[PDB]
Amino acid sequence: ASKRIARSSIDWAKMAESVPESQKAMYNQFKAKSDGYIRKALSYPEQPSPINWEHYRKSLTNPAMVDAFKKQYEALKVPYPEDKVSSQIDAQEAEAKKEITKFIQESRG
Amino acid sequence: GFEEAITLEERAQKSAEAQIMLFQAKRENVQFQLEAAYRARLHHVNNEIKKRL
Amino acid sequence: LEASTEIQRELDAELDKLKKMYGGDTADLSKFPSFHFEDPVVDPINM
């Protein structure tokens, strides 16, 4: 419902300059793998296709079933699901920070 | 050679700095997948109601 | 009112075709469809 619409995209240019190319060729796999999920993110935007309920109300002889369907559609409005492994990324983020500090001080030495 | 070895270490430190944006890219990759799955169901629900109509 | 047999066969053919087209055998199309959803699949952290 929030957080990440398709507009969000990190700076690939700085990331591409940082990696040692074929030494980190999994980034070349990672970008295409993330790009494939962008293709899934290309389809199915937030809102669905609107439906003209009044046309089916007038065309059908008894529009009570259309009103019941519209009422149930408005009642059933499920929100977003739950994030699963965000804590694991957060845990590896803290481990990355420790490896960042360790690599920084060794390079300083 | 000492000057080049300094610049190589400078690049290595910068790649360590970009590790954070990789993690954010992984977080956005997870959120993108969960959005594409949930919104397709929202598209599928709308198509099923249109199918009923 | 005083419908012939072929009209009755025509009506049954149309109802059977609509049932097979929209899948009315599995679920009641007159009522709200019972959604059977599932949790979305999230990839592991590493490759």
DSSP track, C1-47: ----HHHHHHHHHHHHHHHHHHTTTTS-SSS-------PPP---S--
Write the Ramachandran bin of A44: left for phi over 0, alpha for psi from -120 to 50, otherwise beta.
left
Cα→Cα distances B2→A29, B5, B10, B20, B33, Å: 34, 5, 12, 29, 46
Radius of gyration, alpha carbons of chain C? 21
Q: Is C29 on the interface with B (CB under 8 A)?
A: yes
* CB neighbour list of residue B14: distance below 8 Å, 6 or more residues apart: A17, A18
Exp. method:
cryo-EM
Please say whether the beta carbons of A86 and B30 come within 8 A. yes
Separation CA B31–CA B37 (nearest Å): 10
**Are the beta carbons of A81 and C40 closer than 8 angstroms?**
yes
The alpha carbon dihedral of B41, B43, B49, B51 has a sign of negative
Q: Is A80 helix (H, G, I), strand (E, B) or coil?
A: coil
Burial of A97 (0-12, 13-18, 19+ CB in 10 A): middle
DSSP A5-63: -TT----HHHHHHHS-GGGGTHHHHHHHHHHHHHHHHHSS-SS-----HHHHHHHSS-T
Chain centroid offset of residue A105 CA: 36
- Best C20, C43, C47 residue to mutate vs chain B (most B CBs within 10 Å): C43
CA atoms within a 13 Å half-sphere pointing along the CA-CB vector of A91: 5
**What would the two tokens of residue C36 be?**
């059977």
Q: State whether C45 and A89 contact (CB < 8 Å).
A: yes
Which candidate from C32, C39, C42 shows the least CB-CB separation from A85? C42
Report how far Cα B48 is from the mean position of its chain's Cα atoms. Answer: 31
CA distances (Å), A67 to each of B22, C28, C30, C35, in order? 49, 17, 12, 19
Tokens of B47: 């198509």
Give chain C's end-to-end CA distance (angstroms, integer): 70
Contacts of A33 in chain B (CB under 8 A): 29
C-beta contacts of A4-7 below 8 A and 24+ residues apart: A4/B28, A4/B31, A4/B32, A4/B35, A5/A46, A5/B35, A6/A38, A6/A41, A6/A42, A6/A45, A6/B32
CB A38 within 8 A of CB B33: no
Contacts A65 to C, Cβ<8 Å: 30
Give the resolution to one decimal, in Å: 2.6
3-state helix, strand and coil shares in percent for chain B, rounded to the nearest 5: 95, 0, 5
* Angle at CA of residue B21, ends B19 and B22, nearest 5°: 65
